[model samples]
Target chain A: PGTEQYLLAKQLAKPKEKIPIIVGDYGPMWVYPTSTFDCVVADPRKGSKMYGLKSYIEYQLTPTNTNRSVNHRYKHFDWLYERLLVKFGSAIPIPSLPDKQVTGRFEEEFIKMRMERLQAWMTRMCRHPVISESEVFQQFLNFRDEKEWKTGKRKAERDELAGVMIFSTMEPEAPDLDLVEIEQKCEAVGKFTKAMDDGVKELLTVGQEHWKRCTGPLPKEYQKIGKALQSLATVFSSSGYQGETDLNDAITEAGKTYEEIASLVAEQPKKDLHFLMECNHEYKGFLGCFPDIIGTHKGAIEKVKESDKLVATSKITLQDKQNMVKRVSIMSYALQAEMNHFHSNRIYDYNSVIRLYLEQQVQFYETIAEKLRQALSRFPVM
Target chain B: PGTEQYLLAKQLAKPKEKIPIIVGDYGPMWVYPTSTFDCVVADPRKGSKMYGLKSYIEYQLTPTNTNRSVNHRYKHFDWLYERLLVKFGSAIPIPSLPDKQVTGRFEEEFIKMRMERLQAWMTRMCRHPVISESEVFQQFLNFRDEKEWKTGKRKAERDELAGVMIFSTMEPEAPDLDLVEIEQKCEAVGKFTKAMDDGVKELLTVGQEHWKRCTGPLPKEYQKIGKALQSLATVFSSSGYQGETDLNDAITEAGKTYEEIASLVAEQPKKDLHFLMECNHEYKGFLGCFPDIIGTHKGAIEKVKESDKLVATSKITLQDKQNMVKRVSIMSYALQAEMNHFHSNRIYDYNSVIRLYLEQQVQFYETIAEKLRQALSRFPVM
Candidate 1:
């Protein structure tokens, strides 16, 4: 038994908050997780109120922090140092001692360290996908004697595991996991991760260049933020890696799941890719940004050279490259703004500037996440 | 004489700064008050950056605090106070007092004291209309300019002569000396004062019956405020009042001068009450609440005795009354809200919601003080 919001909400409960409840389209109903035994048993039954920081952070923060420490420190070093490489490479060249001391070069070491950490997390989650269907169902049940209890649990569970979670659990039952569907989903998650990661990287890049110029001394607070951003990159990379690996397994398992679910029950017709594409387009317009090609952008991972080699080569150092970078940055930023405007003109329908678009953009991204889910359903079988 | 923003700004040597500006249908020429101006000065010349304090306060704290304060505060002082007043009134038994010194009498005194203080401020302003005008304009100017202006003048000039040095020095041509216009303005101020007094008396009568049924210790703030209100009324009536009386006279003089200027310039068209009404409506709506008349509400003063009575009676004390009056104020407020809503709707379509009716409300209310303005405008030979 599954419902859309319930399933989707389950997948969304991660990195924290680990509980998802959404106001649904029609009358409100509880949608719960559908995976059997392990998925439900792993987590204890908790009320909706327990869905916030305390519950998820209690155990997760300890291990999660421990797991990502090396990556976090390396990411901070890499981001702060490597960022000025392009603009200040020669103008305000970095120190050579650290690079020489490091096995290969600092940049390579940083990138390698980051990727190694990322892959490790990705491998862990794929080996044991922590979130399950029944856990969501159990949580939804707590609100029993309320609304959803009155209704049957079947559809509620299905709808509850909307996007990634829905697809992951369903994969074991599919006879043949569609490669095209897997490709699309991987690309979707990859693109989502890439977009967020690149955005953060680009912002930090500016800061890295600024420090190199030494225009004025930045306060410790500012430096702390730089450190924080680096830490975030590591944290995010871990999540992204985990997401990627889980998706990969789900792809392999889908073939079996498709056949299993199909023989046992005739699944409802899924929403088409076109619906998702429209959702993406709607999202682009809402975000006041460019539209992405749906199938191509699924959360795809960019594989780098051997982890050891990466750690050995990539590196940068601080220098006085302020004047050179500032002029270039101004022209670059202005051009970026112009390019964005041009892109917006090309992508958005001419008359799409409704104030509701602000609210809709948030919804559109949410819907896109939902679409990722619908795409995942294409694997139903086994 | 100093009725309009332009006139006042000009007099203060605050050269109008109409550096390129945009105009809304309702808000023509935004004011750019001096940064020093704590209050917004509505400096039209500068394109409307500096709005007077009262209006600016509305803009800041109440961005949504309008009419919503009761609902916001409803949790703290539940509907018990309101429910008791409506259901039981004088017939209901008084609950045990929370404090013994003023055990059962808190509610009645709280209401009466609040209304009486508001009345006192009103009476004080009415009698010394010129002083009120000067204080308001000067205070507003001080706020707009971001200047730390001392609220003192040569005591002889302020007391016996009744004119602030900065204001009088600027308003050399003010019509306060115009015998005919001044006389008319004084009389109009008298009428408005009488109307407000009647309103306060009525409001107090309603509060008296409800006060008898106090269950808890009397609210300390309410008791203190009750005394202030009576004190204000006494001084206003008996004339032992301090220099606070000067602000009213200043306002009265400003009103007379404005009329003369209007007549001299022959822009009688701008004097329409309908337009001011629309401005008032829109100004409030800009902060998210509609005129309390429609369905909007505010947590600020329920009514301004004369838009400038705070000086005559300390604004801090009136604030408490504003809080206490809520218990007995529902029916009247709801009615006002309905009436305001109906009227706002009626006027909005024909006139722009921001400009037409709201502005007219302000312009029209000021007109009562501007009897001289109306008089000299039509005099043919002022």
Candidate 2:
């Protein structure tokens, strides 16, 4: 009745589209922050010694226009990362979350740096309307039940986030929507991801063979060449050759690109698809119950013939039935809008982002190869 | 007349294995160190910014009773690791060599620890008679020709090591050999390595899936179970979870196990196989040229009546021809011995080790599962 009511009213006053009444209580969507809130590490417990020492990344996220703060852990952020990949695979080149490490998990500087990366990824995704309006993201930002939060979080960790298969049963009613376009984009992105995966695996094989040559039964003349090749091979064989910029490091980084794309390609259609299914479910329910209202209205109309006094009541009842029909029609239209938005986003926005990311990946590999080649060229082979 | 002549006599005096004749100049096998001399990292370079830093491992080896320092690098150690794996896939649980890392490549502590590991691996391999007698090992230990060493090394780097296929074409004349026995043993080791590889891959998949479940869309009632499962999954997901004892860590360790096994299983037959081929080639050479000796003997016998003086010289030549025939017979026997040793080692030593390793792998997984179960049981599931 206090600040909530004030905010609701302010939201409701904004212009609404024809089908969506934009109820003020949930209306006037606050512009989400483009970046993650500065998360501080809290409750750094000595995690289970059975595995290794790890500290928690604890932070509170207060969504704009709400006084409520949501507590999150590093795993929760991992959850968010997974969801974003699922919902917007082609829409962005999602940054990889820091690997689960024994030593640096609790380091202040490392945590801060990771937080910044998470923030950047979140901000980038939030800029896209489709992701910003995603139901999962909304739930992530606003869900307040600590019991349910813990419950949902546990469920998420167990679910197939990486291999999420979405919207298989959904049947959208819009015949002219060109949903085929969405399928093509998903496939295109998936192909690129697969290509990248295979490409890196090939590189590993090549690198390994090059390493093998260093001890190969080569003749007296080519030993120097062997050294250079072995050194070159080390770039891929080692985990961190160039500090953060090593080839394997690059390969590791490239892995996330494909993984993210894979997740998104696999998961993107489910949200709106699920929403459509829910709408159909509601429609079926309305169909099952609406006859009672119709019967009551008919009975009132019959009574009006028996007595003029009944006429006034019958008229009012008739108007209520008409409003019910209008509401049902509006609901159907809203469902259509949601699906259309989803399809259009895939063809226009998602595909463009996917192409951009693929090009970026190509450039990344080329740069690494060039750098390694230059280094090898410096060695005396003769 | 030269140092080579003295070295040859020394080697011949020690022993002669019939036709082998213990070749003189390159003979007198240098006594290998039972342990690696302490190696110091010298000229620790900041290394190239593009590639990474490195240092040389220099150690003194007194080969043939002369002391000289040998310079090696990580690649050289890598070369040693590969060789050991190729030669002794079944004989031991080869330790995983230190992985390449950015910050500690040249660090004193890191290099020392790595050197210790390299030493341990080398000393263990040297203890084995087959490996100590290996030509490659001899070259590694005593090759003092810097120019040739440099030349041979360059050639090695250019050749493919991992995909090396050996013993493709070689025939043994030994009729007593049940070579099918060796083939069976190689197959057995190969099967186990494959099984272990697939098993660990399965575990990774299952572990990842279990982790996925902890964050899946499950109801609130199952949160604790999810938490427990997630905790359990950490054992497989993190590196060095139990330091070196973690199942995945063990799985990773076992990778080197089977990889070493895989390498050894593949490379083992090549040396003897190559030796057999050389024997055949030499035998052909003798067959092509020795008819003259036979003709000379026949002529000398026929001309014996021509003069008693001629008969004396002829008798001398006849005795020499007899000695040559004896040498050829002995050569055949030596080849047979080599093949016999190769076969016996496979059936008795290699197969036995492979079976032991497989059993050890089974135990490792069982222990991890037990540990995980115990940890999971401690969690409140309700």
Candidate 3:
């Protein structure tokens, strides 16, 4: 009931102006956002503990612009998400919030995961041009009084300029937009998304298998060899040759090293492959957003073609059709800006994720290597 | 024909006096060998290449006693091995030389492996009290002329005592040997062999599987992830956001590191697991030696038991029974020495094999880890 009501309240996204901040040698390779605001989502604690009426975890959201903290429940985040989705109307590829986990919502791992995803989700929303200054977003962070918060929510829900109507309200930063060039760029994103969607999935599949091996087969193989050496040492030691004490010691040392390596191998998957799997999954979710945005853009173009047919049938005048193109042009311009925004974020995300995974993997390999080296050094000279 | 004649000729093993050289605090934990000598098997070079007649590789053998080197062909070593086996009569667990590689007889890896195995085989032979001074081994490294070598071969073959008769020629290493205590220890070895044979085999199977994964699935997983990252970076790059160049650089760096790691992972099996698999396989061969020696000991005991039965049936006089016991005592004493000798070598082989394998493994892991550490260091601060 709370999720539904809250989501319904936060809608009404205003049209954002694209600031012509040309990047690189090619002039205006899609405009960047004029400004961005950072946010922190932290301190999730269980609420309604004493009463036990509605037990749920609430997160503390703090935006850099306000410097004020807001305590919001998962449903509130869901509502903000709804608002952004409705307002953006498939223009921008909005990142998804963590899904509701009925089974292990209060579990330690799940809570931490949800918190991390929420922080990322919140940051992306705040970095957005329109969503950053949207009424729903502002109210979500600032509204404290329960009754007034719902009242403010109603104010946004009743706002007329949202969804398809919201495009008419936007003022294009590039009045002389080379829409032909923009469409071509959007086409590149379409193909990239198609390939990337499969590529990321392939990464996830491979990562999970590798993770399984490290934890199960890889470590077990070492442990088996270690155990074999230890048993063989006993058999050899019982043979009653005093000269071999040194040799036996070396074998014992070797056996222990392999056992240690097994432990290291078992622990490695969580540190390295875990990040890889999650990032791949998250990117998959983000990739899903692109298809929706593409479909919306195509639909808009289809709408213009349908209107032209109506003019030919005299159901609408040629003048009305001309007027319709101007309006559709504004939507097209805004749509390209949204595509650029997605592309900008994609660069940041893939870059960060790949670097972080590699960094973690490197640490895993380095530590194991060091342990082996130390093991070798520890062997007595014989 | 040369191998058969030389092997048959090197059979008359001169019996040596027993020296009670007890090792450790345990008084005579089965008597150790009275003394030892060492030999080097190296400098393998293909012969008859210039002449183009009877092409073969010859190894240089150097025994410490003579301080001389003799070039011997594979068949010469083969002859020496057969002579040792015939003279020893399963009295000890002799390590086998590397089997002939029919396909890649002169390949780089095969030559190196054969050399290593031959070195190990030669070391074990030198370490043995009886085999070290056996007529075949001494003549192998001492006789340079072709005719004299064949003469020595004919002399050894003409000797009356060889095979089962060779055991009768061996003098007891311990005159005060507790036959009962020695038999009990030999039984321990019998059970140990049963378990260890399977255990070492298990280790080999596991090692091979692990090696396969490292070379194939494990390394390939990292490479796939690296390629995925690289492709994703290009896709993001074409979207035309300049701020992402740093992100692209980081992603590119990350991709390269994983790719680098893939190469390391692929190379690791040859370094680490290769040793493990070989050692495990070599030990498996050594383990197979135990059953034969154990059976021989049991057979000697059976012979004494049958002789007692013959006396009980009045086939021999009581005085003859006493004399026979005394003669068999020497056999029993020597048999225990053989058992102890096998046990002593076991300690050395297991110890060295385990330590060397682990040391190689440590180096591989350490190098990979160091590479990762280096990779992490090179990542740009973003």
Writing each residue's lDDT as its tens digit, candidate 3 over A1-382 gives 2211112223344444322323334332334356556889888887763766557888888887768887888888888787777766556666777776667578678888788888877877777766776777778788777776889788777765556655555555544433355455557667878887877777777777777877887788779777776776666565555676766665666678779989988997777678767777877877888887776555555555677578888876776665556555655666666656666566556556656766776677667767666666655554
Displacement of residue B128 (Cα, Å) in model 3 is: 2.7
Which stretches in model 1 have alpha-carbon errors above 4 Å?
A1-124, A127-382, B1-382
Ranking by TM-score: 3, 2, 1
Clashes of 3: 5
lDDT by residue (B320-368, candidate 2, tens digit) is: 4433333233223322333233223323332233233223333433333
List iRMS for all predictions.
33.6, 24.6, 2.9
Which residue runs does candidate 3 get wrong by more than 4 Å?
A1-71, A100-106, A243-257, A302-322, B1-71, B103-112, B192-195, B243-250, B305-313, B339-350
Q: How would the docking of model 1 be graded?
A: incorrect
TM-score of chain B of 1: 0.19
Q: Rank the candidates by lDDT, best first.
A: 3, 2, 1
Residue A32, candidate 3: Cα error in Å is 9.8
* Each candidate: chain B TM-score: 0.19, 0.32, 0.84
TM-scores of the models, in the order given: 0.14, 0.22, 0.83
Residue A99, candidate 1: alpha-carbon lDDT? 26
